[PDB]
Amino acid sequence: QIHWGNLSKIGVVGIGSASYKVMTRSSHQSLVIKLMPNITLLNNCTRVEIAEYRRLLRTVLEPIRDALNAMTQNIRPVQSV
Amino acid sequence: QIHWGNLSKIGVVGIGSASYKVMTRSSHQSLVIKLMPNITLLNNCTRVEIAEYRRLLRTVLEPIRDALNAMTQNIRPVQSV
Amino acid sequence: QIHWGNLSKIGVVGIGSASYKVMTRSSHQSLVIKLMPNITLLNNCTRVEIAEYRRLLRTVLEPIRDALNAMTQNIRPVQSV
Amino acid sequence: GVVLAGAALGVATAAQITAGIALHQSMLNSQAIDNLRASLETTNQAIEAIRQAGQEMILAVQGVQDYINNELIPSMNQLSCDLIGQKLGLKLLRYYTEILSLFGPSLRDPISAEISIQALSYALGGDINKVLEKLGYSGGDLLGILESRGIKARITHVDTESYFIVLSIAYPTLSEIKGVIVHRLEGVSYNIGSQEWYTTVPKYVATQGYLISNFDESSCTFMPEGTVCSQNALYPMSPLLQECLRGSTKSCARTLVSGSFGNRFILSQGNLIANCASILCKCYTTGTIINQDPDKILTYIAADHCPVVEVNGVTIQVGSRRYPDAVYLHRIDLGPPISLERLDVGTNLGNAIAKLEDAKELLESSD
Amino acid sequence: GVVLAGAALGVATAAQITAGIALHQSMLNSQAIDNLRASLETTNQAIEAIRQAGQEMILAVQGVQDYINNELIPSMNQLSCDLIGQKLGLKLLRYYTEILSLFGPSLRDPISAEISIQALSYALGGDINKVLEKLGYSGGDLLGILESRGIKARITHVDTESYFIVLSIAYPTLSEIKGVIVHRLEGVSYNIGSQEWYTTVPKYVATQGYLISNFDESSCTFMPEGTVCSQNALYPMSPLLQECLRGSTKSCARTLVSGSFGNRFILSQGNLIANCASILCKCYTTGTIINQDPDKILTYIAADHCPVVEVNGVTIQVGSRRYPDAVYLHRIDLGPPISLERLDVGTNLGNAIAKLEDAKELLESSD
Amino acid sequence: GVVLAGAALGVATAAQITAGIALHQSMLNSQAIDNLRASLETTNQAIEAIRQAGQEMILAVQGVQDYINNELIPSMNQLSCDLIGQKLGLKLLRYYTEILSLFGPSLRDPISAEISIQALSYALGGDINKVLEKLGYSGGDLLGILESRGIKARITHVDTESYFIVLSIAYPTLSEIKGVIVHRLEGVSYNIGSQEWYTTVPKYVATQGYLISNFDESSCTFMPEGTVCSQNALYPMSPLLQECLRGSTKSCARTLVSGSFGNRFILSQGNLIANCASILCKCYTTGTIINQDPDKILTYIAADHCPVVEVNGVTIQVGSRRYPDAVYLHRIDLGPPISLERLDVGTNLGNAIAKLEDAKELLESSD
Numbered sequence A, B, C: 001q002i003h004w005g006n007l008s009k010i011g012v013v014g015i016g017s018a019s020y021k022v023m024t025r026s027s028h029q030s031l032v033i034k035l036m037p038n039i040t041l042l043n044n045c046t047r048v049e050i051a052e053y054r055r056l057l058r059t060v061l062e063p064i065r066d067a068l069n070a071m072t073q074n075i076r077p078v079q080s081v
Numbered sequence D, E, F: 001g002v003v004l005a006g007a008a009l010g011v012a013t014a015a016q017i018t019a020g021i022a023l024h025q026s027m028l029n030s031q032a033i034d035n036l037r038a039s040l041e042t043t044n045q046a047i048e049a050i051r052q053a054g055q056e057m058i059l060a061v062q063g064v065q066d067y068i069n070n071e072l073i074p075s076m077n078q079l080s081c082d083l084i085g086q087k088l089g090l091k092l093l094r095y096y097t098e099i100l101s102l103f104g105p106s107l108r109d110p111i112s113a114e115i116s117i118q119a120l121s122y123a124l125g126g127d128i129n130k131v132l133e134k135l136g137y138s139g140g141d142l143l144g145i146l147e148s149r150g151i152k153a154r155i156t157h158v159d160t161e162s163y164f165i166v167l168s169i170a171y172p173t174l175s176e177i178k179g180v181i182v183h184r185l186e187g188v189s190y191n192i193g194s195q196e197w198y199t200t201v202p203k204y205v206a207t208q209g210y211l212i213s214n215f216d217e218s219s220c221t222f223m224p225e226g227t228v229c230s231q232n233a234l235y236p237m238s239p240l241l242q243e244c245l246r247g248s249t250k251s252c253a254r255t256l257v258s259g260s261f262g263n264r265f266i267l268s269q270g271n272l273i274a275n276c277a278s279i280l281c282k283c284y285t286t287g288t289i290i291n292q293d294p295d296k297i298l299t300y301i302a303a304d305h306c307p308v309v310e311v312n313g314v315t316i317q318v319g320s321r322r323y324p325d326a327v328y329l330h331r332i333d334l335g336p337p338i339s340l341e342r343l344d345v346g347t348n349l350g351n352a353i354a355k356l357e358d359a360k361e362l363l364e365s366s367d
Ligand SMILES: *[C@@H]1O[C@H](CO)[C@@H](O[C@@H]2O[C@H](CO)[C@@H](O)[C@H](O)[C@H]2NC(C)=O)[C@H](O)[C@H]1NC(C)=O
Pocket: B003, B006, D246, D247, D248, D249, D250, D330, D331, D332, D333, D334
């Protein structure tokens, strides 16, 4: 299909061929990011910092939760029609 | 202005519009990077490292100071003309 | 060669020229990445972690060693012809 | 009022001139420096608002002080003096590497450079959240977050006697340009023969009165109530591509789908626009396949003919018709096929120029 | 079976529709959340497989727990309570910055986003190797490494009551497309006069039955037994560049070498193809220089004429001839000269369009 | 003298051949490896010059030794044995991730790869300053800094018995090419009607005897006494854009300003070149506005007519005239309007090719 002879007359050569494999994704596995650490062995020494951390997180987490709910609330079982 | 009907005949649709807001910068606030740390509670234990740090910094800081002076020395109050 | 007058009639000016210096590499110096740390003052406390580290490294190092051997085994002194 | 010595300076861009004057208006006076120098000497925190009544607050940041205070000082009578010095030396070399990276020779024009607050992150101790709280940003809503991250700094003073850098920042606020509408465009593939095509248009365009413009979404965040951009996003669009978006289908280019698929369908205005030659379309309500007329290129599915449609295995209820029934391909002027890979562009342009130089000799001989 | 409320939703890309249904099929049921919430509360490790018999294993990761467990807890009765809090606060702000960076407003469409496992690295504690071992990846061969790094995650649940994010991943495996061959192309310069040229072709192309295609090597690893790509790599090639690769030398474009050299020679099929006008070529066997015929542009060196050749100071033994003796330049149709810099492309296209608009007025007047 | 087995090897680029021979010339002899292996075993520092009299110095670096020596060993009798192992394990996994990232499958050709010293930073313990000091670089002037950061390494040996990698570096020094002058170009907008244009030229060009060339400033630092580039920066420029820079104004393309402004003025040779149709220009000396003749496109402001000019609110003193008084637009041949967005380029090229294929049928019928 590729004409190596005519290409070689203008300085182009093939220096390797290979088969082509693509990654396809299958099966599933749930991964959970636990954002709140276990601090019990710190005896209330991080209470202010943890509360502030939690407050910063809410600004980030609420829009994502809302975006996910906006989609799944439009997904009903078939017989609702 | 955009003709959605004719575009839809060749598979192009609009899937959202929004207003356009750009950030403009106003007011001012000074921020200072203090390059030299307070080491007094280390009792001369970092004297060699601090002196070497200072020497490395000079190579970087002097050209910038010089570039800033090269400009402001050409900026005089109006009556110098 | 560049015609500053005609360019200025369409708003283009030169705002600086400089000589051109390129870096050329010369001489040589050997640098060795020692991947295995000295752990003797840790009294066998990292034996499991070190062994696992070594196992992960082998997957990476063997193909490179093989690629280097594939080339140098084709490089002989001149008189082999 | 100040004047620039233009004959002395000789050459400068508008950007350098305005930043140079700005440098004069915003740099601290000569003895505020001596005051600042003395305040810095007597402090020992990582971040500190330096307030001298009369003068404005100056935010001072020390990039390795938290490490000294939290890690080295509490070890002061448990580790050797050599070890303490070795520990701090490693931090100082890593910090110097960042100062060098940001303020070294890779900084082309220190007078007009604007450094983003995030690029200053390491110079400020590896995190900028406490700086932003001291300046009044709470982190409580996403817009304040975007604005806080749009802060840019200019260098106004470099002290080689006491080793500090004074920067001036400005606060971003939102400027709504009510006449500009940003539009997100999205395409579906269609079939001509055995070739699968789609129309090449930008992902985002802007309308602005008479104009259709390009839109750079790089610096933008698509908030629910508006597009927030930290920089100008509008850029010119060629008249031909504007004509394409104005309804001239022959002006729109097209290309073949990559890989083996496009987006073969899309939900828009409660209807399904689908390439039903390329995927299985089926009316769920009646159980009957939906065939695409072979001299049509797309199917526009609405509830007047199929209330619940299945499309590539997904079941979608649709609303009333908002898109006309497909017309025959012969009633659509399709535009030119193109490739967007740069080498394909160059090879085809070289050929076109060569064909044009041939044509340049023939039309004088006959005429 | 589920149905999407398309009239209610109004607008959605195919990607958003399929990810939305996938979100329904893969999200945890409402009380598995209450169970998961309780399991998370009672654990204290950095990474932990949460097994509740009946339900599938859920891998829980806590991004600052190793720091708390290894650095803060052992200091609990040697540092002050304030200092302990200050130490953890710095980690939490740095961790929040990463959560914000990944899950904040820069994430355009959380429903259809696919986050690479490496982009999750900081959210998972700064390293992903232990996660991959718990999922069964050993790190023992390079292919498993590539597959493990091809994992992408989707968000399936965000808990604002207990602050956790549930993601679903899928395992990559290799799908061989036996009809596609990937080819690496490599060129040598040749001289026309005092100009040094080379032919402009892509570094990688693919053949696929009748088709020659472009190939994006960005996502590929060239393993010894095949090209492994984590994404589709095939993309269309214009017919003209395909014709070039099919032997039409006049369709191939060319450009001048950058700097002052090309690749003036190459070993291919045991022969040396060399621009011997531009470098010294010499037969080592006989000691005689190898001159390039001046109406030829390249020299094809094989053992029939020179068993051991010296080329730019390097001595190479060659095999029997696999490339014909060079033909005269006059027997080669060379293609158009081009530039690939984008401004050069734009300037030459603007000129060509202008020349074409002139030509648009002349050929009706004479005809 | 060595010879390459080209028939055995079959295929290789010039880059691979020269690096392969270089590999033979620079790799350590077989028993220097056994010596090096024994020296490495008995050392315990993060960085160490290994001197064996007779042989050259070899710089040995251990990427986690400072952490072991500074953090783990001093804790040896205060933390449990398990905890010590857990602490080091985290460092080893993070270090392995970097080794994998740099030396794993993403490294296409280990024989001819050149790894920048900065890319080795993490493999060398997270910072390169101490390595550079041991090699003789002081950090005392910016040029030595640039040269030190231009070091590239080649792999010469990988030891799978004792797990170490030998690299060979070379020292960069500056090679001045006295015939090449680098020029920075800078434009101001001008008005044609209600359209605001500027001429499209590159930011940097190079003159080289007869030639004007493109210039890639990516790898360059603009030092006060010369442009220092760590790589070749020169690249071809199309003849048409060269003609533009040689004074053919009709060869220069132009485009519309982005957003709503250009650079409406610039200081050059002590004069102000200004689009005074687009901004307020005013003579400060006399207090009188400076109007732009409407059949002129720019104003060239010098001290013969206005010693101190105000331009967009900035006051600039100017020198004697170095640019002629503006000529009428009708005495300037303007070049073609263009767009640089790639989709606009593709759409206009597709149209031009289509118009050219029409034209390909008409000029034989009449002729
Ligand atoms: C919508 O598209 C069609 C083409 O697909 C336009 O119709 C063409 O218009 C040109 C010039 O206006 C005529 O010369 C052609 O004969 C028409 N072609 C066909 C197939 O009808 C129509 O004008 C477009 N509408 C808009 C607003 O642009």
